[PDB]
């Protein structure tokens, strides 16, 4: 079996000035269009997604053991 | 800007039961909630001593990544110092961690979200709310 | 539409996939930080997105209530 | 560089009505506009006492994120004190929030943008414009 | 760090009367006191509408130089906005400048020093002290 | 940490912008204590203000806060 | 760079007794010493509950001004949480603030300078040092 | 290749002869306390503090850590 190694097409891109830069713990992002404008959002900051997701065990912090 | 500081109790309660009423508050207030690093310490401790440390740390990182963690700083410390003296003059008994959280919140003009407003009440200059 | 973030020449940047690419006439843009999101607007049209959505309830400050 | 300070009235008008003409003016003058924190206060108040505070705050956040909010500092305080005194001599009556805004714009040599220039013209050394 | 925010009332009280009890207070707490720029505005208006603008301004400016003047910022404005709405649903009337000063102090977790503590007790999450 | 130097005929200490003085502070008091010196901004004591000039008697008989 | 975190004990000791042996150390290690904000909190409480608060606060201020007060942050909080679980397991008892101070030191790779040294020994991966 | 410029002016205190420093003080450590600044001789930063500044006797006889 044999095939070709090609270069992808250049992508439209936008630079973000330092003043309005995302945090760096942010590295993956979702984008939606509204008219001639595009809205950029960090992915997986959904509260709903987290609430619906994994649970903790049932023992977890049944006692806080904060010093009397 | 930041508006609410979630105390350790409301966090435990939220993480264990993932209740609809809180979910609705969280959405309604996305971006305006933080916790003190003092509460983060308590949560890490809760997971490490936990039966499923791996699993529990994981849910906690999901929580922390969506809310800010404020560093407990000198201004936070100064208010806690004051709060401890105010309270001891009145024989009002409040836990050490709760006292730091109370001081932290007061230093920043933050509202304490808790499910036991009954003990944060004893502190002055402090607003509390019960998100159940 | 998901996407990725990259540093380009000591500055944050954002790919815009074809399904979300800006029109050809948009040559310069203005990036606005609204909380955790960033809004990419064609230079000269910064307000179009805000004017078009984002309605306040109808009661909002019918009364300013400045003393005097 | 900042050229204009939007008073509270113009903001309320714009926010409630989203007028086409104002959109054109804003787009044109983007980067030259600001409000005083005095005006922020009123807008926060407007939302806080409204039917839908978080909804309304979100809209205000959108608006504010595109402009600068100037802190009301000693210089603004000093001009407002003067202005208040100059006005009493004239007997020209102005609201207190408007006085602070007028003082703030004059301290920074900004043009007050408003929806009724009547009030602010009774004020010395102050240029106004009607963008309604 | 700053501890006390002197409202407009003790300022007038202190400036008009130079009371000894207050002198002792300032000596004891020098370095830890400030006023909001809102109060500065009032003081300046006070002097400006005086019968001895010249002399009265000079006294005020000697009072200020020994005291910190905090800028009225976005946090102070947000708290004020919240407070004005909090008081509306209670029918508790506080003045506009008093409200801004309250908002300001709360945002910074400062203790409002006043003599009219009655007007400030209406306000939540705020601590007052009578220094008269 | 800085280096002692001279300026226009006499001794000088530089203040690292970290521990700088407010732009207000134009003149300064100096006290000696052992090998250490203490700097304090001049005219920030309260007695000198209380004993000092007083305001005209009418000053803010009316605060004129609206409402 | 910083090398030392003074614990709370060595601070109460030093401040009360002004021991010249400690005066030597400090002068030598000037620029390499810090305390956790947690310890600052204790010292503040000390002054606040004492007979002469303003006086004691001023001594504490001169001490604190000479060193770094580190904000108790997420890493410090995480180290403390792990440490609490580690000691709880091994039934080694250590006080809550000492736990946070220990956690803070370890997260920064700093040496803990104590009075007693005995309690901090039970903490893994933490270097101590007696300066009394 | 780069252009030569001028550094920013730093803040400095004239130190009167009545209160000048010993000749063996060429390194100095400047501490801020309130609106007050303290000039100490390098390696002697803690002397002034150990000297004055006593705390009332009752000061933390008990730490009261729970
Ligand atoms: Na408890
Ligand atoms: Na009006």
Numbering used by the authors:
A (entry chain D), C (entry chain B): 1G, 2 to 68
B (entry chain C), D (entry chain A), E (entry chain G), G (entry chain E): 1 to 132
F (entry chain H): 2 to 68
H (entry chain F): 2 to 67
The authors write:
Toxin–antitoxin (TA) loci are widespread in prokaryotes and code for an active “toxin” molecule, typically, a translational regulator, and an “antitoxin” that forms a tight complex with the toxin and thus inhibits it. Recently, it was found that VapC (MvpT) from the Gram-negative pathogen Shigella flexneri 2a virulence plasmid pMYSH6000 functions by specifically cleaving initiator tRNAfMet in the anticodon region, thus globally down-regulating translation.
The asymmetric unit contains four copies of both VapB and VapC, for which the VapC structures are complete (residues 1–132), while the VapB structures cover residues 2–67 of the complete sequence (1–75). VapB has an N-terminal domain consisting of four β-strands (residues 1–45), which dimerizes with a neighboring VapB to form a complete DNA-binding domain, and an extended C-terminal tail (residues 46–67) that wraps around VapC (orange). The structure reveals a compact hetero-octameric assembly with two unique DNA-binding domains of the SpoVT/AbrB type that have not been previously observed in VapBC complexes. Secondly, near the C-terminus of VapB, the side chains of Arg64 and Gln66 of VapB point directly into the active site of VapC, where they make close, charged interactions to the conserved acidic active residues Asp7, Glu42, and Asp98. Mutant studies implicate metal ion 1 (right) directly in the cleavage mechanism, whereas metal ion 2 (left) is thought to stabilize the conformation of the active site and enhance substrate binding. Both ions are present in the FEN-1 structure, and comparison to VapC reveals that the positively charged guadinium group of Arg64 in VapB appears to take up the position of metal ion 1, while Gln66 may substitute metal ion.
